[PDB]
Structures are given as structure tokens and as C-alpha cells.
């Protein structure tokens, strides 16, 4: 659905806003970014708009090699450049009658 897409886009972005505030939210987005090898919604640059995330700081889960603190002062070559919304979203659309039906 485009409801599946629009909602996932909206929710992923709202969860990015809550990432600094809620360590459970942080753990959830971390597992998404690490397991699907993606960062941010459209792009890693999306983190630039999130408080507690300076410029040149992304979650460690965006790193290609996840080590403690790797997202601090990150280099573009060391991070997943693709956004999570299109990548995870296409996976959700491909598995929709197993994740959302009542």
C-alpha cells in the first residue's frame, strides 16, 4: 500500500525525532539501520536535522563497521549512504499479508 509507505515514512521520521529521547526507540531504529544497512529516512543527511545529533554525528548503527562511537565525526565512506524508508519500505510492501492483516 501507499498507506504502508506514507505511514512508515512518517513514523520513521517521527521516531528519528524521538531517538535522542527514548533509548527503546533508539534500539529499534538501531536494529533497523544495522540489519537493513541503511541510515536515516531519505539519506544519512537526515540526521543533521535531529537534536543531540550534531552535524557529522550519526547513530553508530549507520556505520558500515559498527563500533562504539563510530558515528562521531563520521566520514561519508564509513557509513551506509542509502535511506531506510525506500529500502525497508519495499521490503514491507513485499511482505504485507504477513505483517499487517487483521
Amino acid at each position, epitope marked *: 500500500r501507499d498507506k504502508v509507505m506514507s*505511514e*512508515f515514512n512518517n*513514523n*520513521f521520521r*517521527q*521516531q528519528m525525532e*524521538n531517538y535522542p529521547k*527514548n*533509548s*527503546h*526507540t533508539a*534500539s*529499534i531504529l538501531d*536494529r*533497523m539501520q544495522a*540489519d537493513f544497512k541503511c541510515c536515516g529516512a531519505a539519506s544519512y543527511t537526515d540526521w543533521e536535522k535531529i537534536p543531540s545529533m550534531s552535524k557529522n554525528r550519526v547513530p553508530d548503527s549507520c556505520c558500515i563497521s559498527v563500533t562504539v562511537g563510530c558515528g562521531i565525526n563520521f566520514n561519508e565512506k564509513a557509513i551506509h549512504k542509502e535511506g531506510c524508508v525506500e529500502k525497508i519500505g519495499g521490503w*514491507l510492501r513485499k511482505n504485507v*499479508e*504477513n*505483517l*499487517y*492483516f*487483521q
Partner: nanobody
Amino acid sequence: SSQVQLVESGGGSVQAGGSLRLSCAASGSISSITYLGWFRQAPGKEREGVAALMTTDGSTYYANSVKGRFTVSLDNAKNTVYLQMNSLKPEDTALYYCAAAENGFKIPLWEYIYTYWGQGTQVTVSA
């Protein structure tokens, strides 16, 4: 995480066509919970969502392979969520996990939205 604990019970071994009722007792800071879900991991297979209940409105969600046979329900007074399982098949054999999700994503049968997990209870269904 340790703010919420989930404890499953009611597993066992039954002959095909029989029934079980799993229960999951939630404790800790559970007022945050938006979905209570049941996941299962069968021998040799990845974990899959089976049934989920949204606390917000009581809505329920089922995997297609269990629709009509399994029912998820919540006894608020006991802080316990149930999975009634009827007409059990050998392919229902699995470790069943209780899980809980807080607010964030509205994808009830996807384990990536759930933060709290029980240890699992074994369900064995004989041919």
C-alpha cells in the same frame, strides 16, 4: 529491556487437531505498551509473527496461516495476554514468544517494532 518483563506459560505437547492456550504475564512499566504480540520460531525456520493485539483499540492481527484457528485476547485485570490455539497442525510446532511494543510504528506482526521479549514456551504438535 528490563523496564518490562514478559513470562509465557501454557505450552505443551498435543496431538494434531487439539488445542492449547498460551498465556503471557506482563510486569513492570507496562502502561507504555501499544502492542502485545505472539511470535514463533519453528525448527529450522526464522521467527514469524503469529498474532498481535493493539492495546489502544483492542484490534487484533493474525498471520494468514493461523487466521480462524488462533485468537489473541487481553485480560486487563490480570495483565495477561492469551493465545487460544485450536485445530493445531504439526507445522504449528515451535517455540512461541510473547513480545511487547511501545509507540512508534504500526506494523503489528513485524518483530522489529517490539522492544520487550519473553523467553518462549515450547508448543509440540504430533502428526
